[model samples]
Target: MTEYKLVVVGACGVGKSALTIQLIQNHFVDEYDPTIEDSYRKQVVIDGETCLLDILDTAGQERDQYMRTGEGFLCVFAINNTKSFEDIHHYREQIKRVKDSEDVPMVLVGNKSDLPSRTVDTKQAQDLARSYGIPFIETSAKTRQGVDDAFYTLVREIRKHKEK
Candidate 1:
């Protein structure tokens, strides 16, 4: 079986824990207290390959340190919060610094897409992803839109990175 460790990172109240819970347990969380470090494991079969995924939902205080160990990252931000969206650059830079390479496998995720009001526009997020040459996806844990796709895309990218 294939094994991968993924890290979900973002600023506070950006839905890192909620997104992780949405993925591993298939449910939406209405109230999320801050978590320092929460780990979840799931067995996923992708492209006929059985894979074990160990995901860490980390607090902002735990940034970069875990990046050195994770195979891939879901760099998430809340679309309704501009500051959270702007923090993506900090997280991305930290990933590059810890991994010692800009080629680290990662995905840019704009969460809470179901909300009507968004401070960070889709085009702005897309431009950032384009600048870094990474895929951009918008997800909503409440409606479950693009949630699975976000994880699957990152896992596929990680597999591609592993092959080379």
Candidate 2:
């Protein structure tokens, strides 16, 4: 089986832990608080092939390290929090710096879509993704919207990058 390591990152309270946990464990935990670095592993089948997936939650210095080492990334932001949405620009820049490539494989996630009040709209998110030439997905840990789709899209892109 192929092995893939994906890093989940964003500002604090952007639902990185919640999304990571929900995707890996297939359930949502009530209180989501991850350590400086949290790790989870799963076996998945994509494109009729089996693969081992490693998902990590990193913050601060560890985030930089994970960015350097991870094969793919889920760059998340809270749609209800405009600041979190803005932070994605810096996050993507750091990823490019760490990976030393403009074409790093990743997905731009707008989390908390289920919230009644949203400050960051779809157009802004899609524009950012377009600028980075990456896929953009909106997910809600509460309602679980677009959660699996975000992960699967990242994995598929990672596979395509590796193939190339």
TM-score of every candidate relative to the true structure: 0.94, 0.92
Report the C-alpha lDDT of model 1 over 1-164, residue by residue, as the tens digit: 88888988888898888888888889999987785687789898988988888898887453446668899999999999999999999989878889998798999999999999899999999999999989999999998898889898999889878861
Clash count, predicted structure 1: 0
lDDT of 1 at 68: 84
The weakest ten consecutive residues by lDDT in model 1 span 58-67
Which runs in model 1 stand beyond 4 Å of their true positions?
60-65
What's the distance in Å from true for residue 107, model 1? 0.4
Q: How would you encode candidate 2's per-residue C-alpha lDDT over 1-164 as one tens digit per residue? A: 88888888898888888887777777776776445566788788877889777888766542456568888989999988899888888888888899999889999999988888789999999999998899999998877899889888999989778871
lDDT of 2 at 31: 74
Model 2 TM: 0.92
lDDT at 5, model 1: 88
